[PDB]
Structure formats: structure tokens, C-alpha cells
Amino acid sequence: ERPTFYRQELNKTIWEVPERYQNLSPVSVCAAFDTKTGLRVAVKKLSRPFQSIIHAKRTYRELRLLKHMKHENVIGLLDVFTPARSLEEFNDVYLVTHLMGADLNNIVLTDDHVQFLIYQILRGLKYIHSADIIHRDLKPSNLAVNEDCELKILDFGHTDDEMTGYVATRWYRAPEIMLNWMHYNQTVDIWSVGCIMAELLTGRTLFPGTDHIDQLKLILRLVGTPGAELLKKISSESARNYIQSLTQMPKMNFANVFIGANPLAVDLLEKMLVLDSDKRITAAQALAHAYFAQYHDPDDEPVADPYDQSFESRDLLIDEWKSLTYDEVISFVPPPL
Ligand SMILES: Fc1cccc(Cl)c1CNc1nc(-c2ccco2)n[nH]1
Numbered sequence: 249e250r251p252t253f254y255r256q257e258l259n260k261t262i263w264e265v266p267e268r269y270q271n272l273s274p275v276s277v278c279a280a281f282d283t284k285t286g287l288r289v290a291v292k293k294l295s296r297p298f299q300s301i302i303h304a305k306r307t308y309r310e311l312r313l314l315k316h317m318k319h320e321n322v323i324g325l326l327d328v329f330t331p332a333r334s335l336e337e338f339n340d341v342y343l344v345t346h347l348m349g350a351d352l353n354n355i356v357l358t359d360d361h362v363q364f365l366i367y368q369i370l371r372g373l374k375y376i377h378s379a380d381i382i383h384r385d386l387k388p389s390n391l392a393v394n395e396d397c398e399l400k401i402l403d404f405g406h407t408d409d410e411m412t413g414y415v416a417t418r419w420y421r422a423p424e425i426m427l428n429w430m431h432y433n434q435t436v437d438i439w440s441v442g443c444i445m446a447e448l449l450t451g452r453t454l455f456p457g458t459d460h461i462d463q464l465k466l467i468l469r470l471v472g473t474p475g476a477e478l479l480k481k482i483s484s485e486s487a488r489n490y491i492q493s494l495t496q497m498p499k500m501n502f503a504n505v506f507i508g509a510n511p512l513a514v515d516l517l518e519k520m521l522v523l524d525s526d527k528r529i530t531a532a533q534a535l536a537h538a539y540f541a542q543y544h545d546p547d548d549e550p551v552a553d554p555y556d557q558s559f560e561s562r563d564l565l566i567d568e569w570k571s572l573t574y575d576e577v578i579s580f581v582p583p584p585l
Pocket residue numbers: 277290291292314323343344345346347348349350351392402403404
């Protein structure tokens with residue numbers, strides 16, 4: 249009742265998977281056909297999952313999060329497995345998820361398409377947020393879609409160099425995390441959605457900053473320089489002091505930046521791209537905004553079960569994180585259909 253495994257070298261690396269998975273080809277991640285469900289799937293083999301304390305914890309983190317997500321606009325775990333028969337042999341973790349059509353880069357729209365896509369991102373963010381999970385990293389490339397425009401949020405669980413220069417890895421991040429102004433929270437995801445929604449409407453990056461400071465300048469041009477109250481809340485005195493060096497600018501008219509756009513879109517953007525994260529609209533409030541009248545259904549916008557992440561504040565040995573990851577592998581129950 250443990251399935252039979254077969255071995256196969258791909259991108260210089262040996263993949264050992266259950267017979268159910270066939271037609272493995274690279275995309276480490278491989279596309280495959282799952283003969284038991286009839287689904288096209290992505291299969292990720294984690295590299296050196298238990299090499300260090302930090303990597304062991306990250307592997308546990310990733311497996312906990314994926315095991316938890318059971319929502320249509322969020323990417324779920326279809327299977328998790330290992331070729332090992334015991335903890336002592338355990339050293340490889342394979343994660344199986346749906347293969348999606350295309351990310352949101354490839355796809356860049358009508359106002360109907362923008363409503364439907366942003367609706368879906370918010371529906372999934374409500375679910376994620378209600379479990380006190382923060383995505384941190386929402387961008388077009390973490391948002392996959394199919395032929396029918398049905399959307400899933402991807403990639404849960406970034407160096408100084410990756411975040412430097414003219415790079416998409418920073419264009420969608422909220423200013424408070426981009427510059428470490430304060431202990432940030434869930435609201436940073438809403439900032440990202442604002443950036444994405446703007447991009448879907450204009451076909452152009454909202455804040456294509458050439459570095460952190462240029463981006464901040466582009467941001468402050470649009471939404472205004474911070475006010476007295478927001479300044480108080482910037483915990484970092486070095487950053488607060490830098491902000492105060494800038495000459496004050498008022499919030500621009502959004503109707504004149506997003507010309508031709510549905511006024512309800514303009515309105516929603518204004519509530520999303522508010523500099524003060526305490527005054528940003530929530531995923532749950534956004535869903536009730538008139539812009540989504542076509543799609544809004546308060547009975548089909550579910551929330552998540554509670555998610556214990558007390559493990560985040562725990563300092564454990566490698567073997568202990570590996571043991572905890574083992575338990576979660578062998579306890580995995582697949583979804584029903
Ligand atoms: F996001 C995760 C997390 C854990 C494992 C895996 Cl394989 C993934 C990526 N999954 C996935 N990506 C896509 C996709 C399709 C097109 C662009 O992205 N479909 N499915």
C-alpha cells in the first residue's frame with residue numbers, strides 16, 4: 249500500500265517518484281501526468297532539504313503552508329512523497345501541485361477581465377489572511393491562470409542582490425517592507441494587488457523603480473508624501489529622518505493617471521494604494537466594493553481554518569525539523585474528488 253517507485257535522471261539529477269506520475273519533463277520542477285487523477289501536475293523535488301537548520305525549517309514551513317491551503321484561488325497540495333521507508337533514510341521531499349496554464353506575465357485587458365482576475369486574487373487573499381498568513385511576495389509571476397481566466401495564487405514559504413536595481417522582485421512590494429519602516433502586516437499584500445490591478449488596466453508597471461529610492465520617489469509622487477501621523481508610526485528613525493528630507497508632495501488625481509478607466513476601478517485603487525498601511529482596504533472589505541458587483545457573493549467567499557505557526561518562533565535542531573517534516577509527509581491525506 250506504499251506505492252512502487254521508479255528512478256529517472258533529468259536535469260543532472262535523479263528523480264524517484266511513484267508509478268502514478270508519468271511523462272516527467274523539466275520546467276527543480278517537472279511537469280507530469282498523474283494517471284490516478286487525470287491531472288497535469290507540477291512536481292518539485294526540494295534540493296538538500298535538511299542541509300542546515302535554516303533549510304530544514306524552510307522545508308517544514310513550506311510543507312505546513314501547502315498542507316493547509318484548501319481554497320480554489322490558492323494553490324493546494326495534491327500529493328507529497330518520499331522514496332524513504334523510514335526517518336533514518338529520509339532525505340528527499342517531493343511536492344505535487346496542479347499544473348496551471350500561464351502566469352500573469354505571459355498574459356499581459358478588458359475591464360471585465362480585470363474585475364474577474366482581481367476578484368479572484370482578493371477572494372484567495374481573504375482566505376489566506378483569515379488564517380493570519382501573509383503572502384509577502386505577490387507579483388504577476390506568482391499568479392497563474394487557465395484558459396477560462398480562473399486564477400490561483402502561487403509561491404508560499406530573497407537576497408539583497410535579487411532585490412537590487414531595475415527588478416520586478418521589488419516593483420510590487422509595499423513601501424514599509426521595501427524600506428523596513430515598521431513591523432509590517434497583512435496589508436502589504438493589498439499594496440501588491442494595487443500594483444497588479446494598475447498594471448492590468450494600463451498594461452504597464454506602476455512603480456518600475458531603478459532602485460529602492462527611485463521607486464520610493466515614484467510611489468510618493470503618486471500617493472503623496474507621508475503626513476504627521478504616518479511619520480510617528482515609522483519605527484525606524486533613520487528612515488523617518490530620510491523621508492523628512494523630501495520636499496512635500498500631495499496625492500495625485502488617480503482619474504488623470506488612469507485615464508479611461510472605470511471610476512469604480514479608480515476608486516478601488518485609491519483605497520488600496522494608501523501609504524498608511526493602517527488605512528488600507530482589506531481583502532474582506534475590497535470584495536464588497538461595487539467594482540465587483542458581477543462576481544461578489546458573500547456566501548462563496550470562504551475563510552480558512554486556524555493555522556498554528558507557533559513553530560516560527562521555535563529554535564530546533566536539524567534532526568528535530570526533519571522529524572517534524574517526516575510526520576507531515578506520512579500523515580498527508582490527499583484531497584477528495
Ligand atoms: F508554488 C508551488 C509550491 C510548491 C510546489 C510547486 Cl510545484 C509550486 C508551483 N506550482 C505551479 N506552478 C504552475 C504554473 C503554471 C504556469 C506558471 O506557473 N502551476 N503549478
